[PDB]
Amino acid sequence: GKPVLHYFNARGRMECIRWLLAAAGVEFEEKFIQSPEDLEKLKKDGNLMFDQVPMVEIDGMKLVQTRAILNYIATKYDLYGKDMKERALIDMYTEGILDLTEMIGQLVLCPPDQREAKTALAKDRTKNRYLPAFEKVLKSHGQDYLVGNRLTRVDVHLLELLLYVEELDASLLTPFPLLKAFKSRISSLPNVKKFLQPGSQRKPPLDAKQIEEARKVFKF
Amino acid sequence: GKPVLHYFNARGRMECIRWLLAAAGVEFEEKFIQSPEDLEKLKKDGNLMFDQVPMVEIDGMKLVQTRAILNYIATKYDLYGKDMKERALIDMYTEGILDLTEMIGQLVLCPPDQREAKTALAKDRTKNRYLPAFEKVLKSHGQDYLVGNRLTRVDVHLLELLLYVEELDASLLTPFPLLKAFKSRISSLPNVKKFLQPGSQRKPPLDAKQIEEARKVFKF
Numbered sequence: 001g002k003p004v005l006h007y008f009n010a011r012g013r014m015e016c017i018r019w020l021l022a023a024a025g026v027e028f029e030e031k032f033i034q035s036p037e038d039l040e041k042l043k044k045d046g047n048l049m050f051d052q053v054p055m056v057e058i059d060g061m062k063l064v065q066t067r068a069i070l071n072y073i074a075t076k077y078d079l080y081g082k083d084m085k086e087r088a089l090i091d092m093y094t095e096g097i098l099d100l101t102e103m104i105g106q107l108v109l110c111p112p113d114q115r116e117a118k119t120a121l122a123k124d125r126t127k128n129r130y131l132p133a134f135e136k137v138l139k140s141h142g143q144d145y146l147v148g149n150r151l152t153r154v155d156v157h158l159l160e161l162l163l164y165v166e167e168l169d170a171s172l173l174t175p176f177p178l179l180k181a182f183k184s185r186i187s188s189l190p191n192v193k194k195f196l197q198p199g200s201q202r203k204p205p206l207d208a209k210q211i212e213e214a215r216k217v218f219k220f
Numbered sequence: 221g222k223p224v225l226h227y228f229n230a231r232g233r234m235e236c237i238r239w240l241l242a243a244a245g246v247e248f249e250e251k252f253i254q255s256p257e258d259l260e261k262l263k264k265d266g267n268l269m270f271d272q273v274p275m276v277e278i279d280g281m282k283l284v285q286t287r288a289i290l291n292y293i294a295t296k297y298d299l300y301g302k303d304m305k306e307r308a309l310i311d312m313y314t315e316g317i318l319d320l321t322e323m324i325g326q327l328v329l330c331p332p333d334q335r336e337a338k339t340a341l342a343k344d345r346t347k348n349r350y351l352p353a354f355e356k357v358l359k360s361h362g363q364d365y366l367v368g369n370r371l372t373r374v375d376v377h378l379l380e381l382l383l384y385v386e387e388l389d390a391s392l393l394t395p396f397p398l399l400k401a402f403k404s405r406i407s408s409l410p411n412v413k414k415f416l417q418p419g420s421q422r423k424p425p426l427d428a429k430q431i432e433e434a435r436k437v438f439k440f
């Protein structure tokens with residue numbers, strides 16, 4: 001009974017879910033939306049509560065909304081900490097990471113005349129707001145993981161973000177030693193290493209031609 | 221030990237938290253950000269993990285990120301369902317609600333040559349996507365509450381959204397009978413009725429002048 005992930009063949013909002021399942025060591029299948037018809041069929045068949053994907057078929061549910069899916073999976077595979085206090089830290093950290101991830105992913109979609117400004121802003125937020133915040137969390141307790149001295153969903157989310165930060169501008173990570181060491185450690189975990197290796201279901205960034213052609217194949 | 225809510229004197233992202241606390245019957249205090257200096261002092265004194273509000277002081281923590289705060293309060297006051305399956309539904313419904321709430325609140329902040337288009341879109345999403353989805357949930361089980369036949373955080377989030385929908389265009393709710401009956405019932409709950417009464421900490425929509433004022437008073 002493998003979860004089925006319904007999304008376009010791209011990172012988008014589904015990648016964080018792919019990462020979480022991979023880290024949990026859970027095998028999943030994907031049903032790619034390749035044409036407006038595919039998407040229309042999902043809607044008509046009553047499979048999308050709000051007519052949007054990501055949508056994940058898991059445990060008899062056709063679950064939509066990225067956060068709801070992530071929350072369910074983290075709880076199911078014990079990657080959501082042990083109590084509500086720990087969950088408050090995990091949630092607070094996760095939301096910050098999701099905010100930056102969105103800001104960065106949004107760049108390739110910015111009108112040409114606005115993209116240089118949006119990019120400088122994203123880089124500024126990365127080095128002056130977000131990375132310092134997490135470097136600080138690690139420094140605060142000197143432990144290997146962000147929360148509870150054990151692996152949780154947020155360690156996975158942070159690793160993922162660091163990869164995107166490295167893609168944006170690798171020099172952004174230079175001033176953060178604790179984060180650099182964290183990146184190396186999480187990357188070495190068996191399930192993670194497996195997802196980072198070539199041939200996995202991990203998705204690449206989309207280039208200009210691809211983004212442009214997909215915006216036209218659908219309605220973006 | 222009343223929780224302390226730090227935000228501007230307006231709805232913003234803090235209103236959903238005010239509503240959740242009020243529905244739980246939990247008294248809270250508010251410390252309004254009235255000047256850039258107020259905000260700067262919060263940041264400098266180490267109160268905001270990502271230099272942003274909402275921020276809520278509760279149980280020895282200074283919690284930021286709207287969803288992290290809501291999740292903690294829901295769990296603390298037993299408004300988060302009874303298990304992970306129920307939480308998946310609560311989470312999926314809540315995310316759809318936050319999505320529409322954002323879309324609607326964002327309108328007063330859209331340029332004079334967009335509000336027009338943005339507003340038609342929002343109204344369309346409301347009547348053709350979101351209201352139908354929830355009308356359908358209620359129809360599916362004929363129960364008084366959205367999930368588990370008992371009050372949860374999402375019944376509160378839905379009531380709040382319905383109020384905003386009614387402010388946008390009262391005719392939007394007309395084609396949805398189950399939602400109209402739901403709105404009346406929830407509004408009759410003692411804690412809810414109390415917050416709906418004049419003089420409560422419930423905040424009003426901000427007008428054009430007020431928006432422009434703050435827009436210049438701060439970096440908005």
Ligand SMILES: N[C@@H](CCC(=O)N[C@@H](CS[C@H]1c2c(cc3ccc4cccc5ccc2c3c45)C(=O)C(=O)[C@@H]1O)C(=O)NCC(=O)O)C(=O)O
Binds near residue numbers: 052109
């Ligand atoms: N709050 C929800 C949000 C879910 C959501 O937004 N889903 C969208 C995905 S399209 C998503 C989107 C946009 C532009 C593009 C542009 C190029 C592109 C190339 C390859 C893959 C995608 C994938 C998504 C996507 C886009 C691409 C832009 O329009 C937006 O940013 C959209 O959010 C969708 O299903 N749209 C169908 C429709 O409404 O009928 C969640 O967290 O799950």
Ligand SMILES: N[C@@H](CCC(=O)N[C@@H](CS[C@H]1c2c(cc3ccc4cccc5ccc2c3c45)C(=O)C(=O)[C@@H]1O)C(=O)NCC(=O)O)C(=O)O
Binds near residue numbers: 099229232431
């Ligand atoms: N993901 C986080 C997001 C939290 C967040 O965004 N906080 C902002 C609130 S300002 C918020 C915002 C904007 C415009 C306006 C414009 C008019 C206005 C009038 C009266 C009250 C507010 C309150 C908020 C606000 C704005 C107003 C627009 O810029 C944006 O929409 C902003 O998100 C903040 O603290 N900014 C300080 C700064 O970065 O240093 C969460 O969910 O908690």
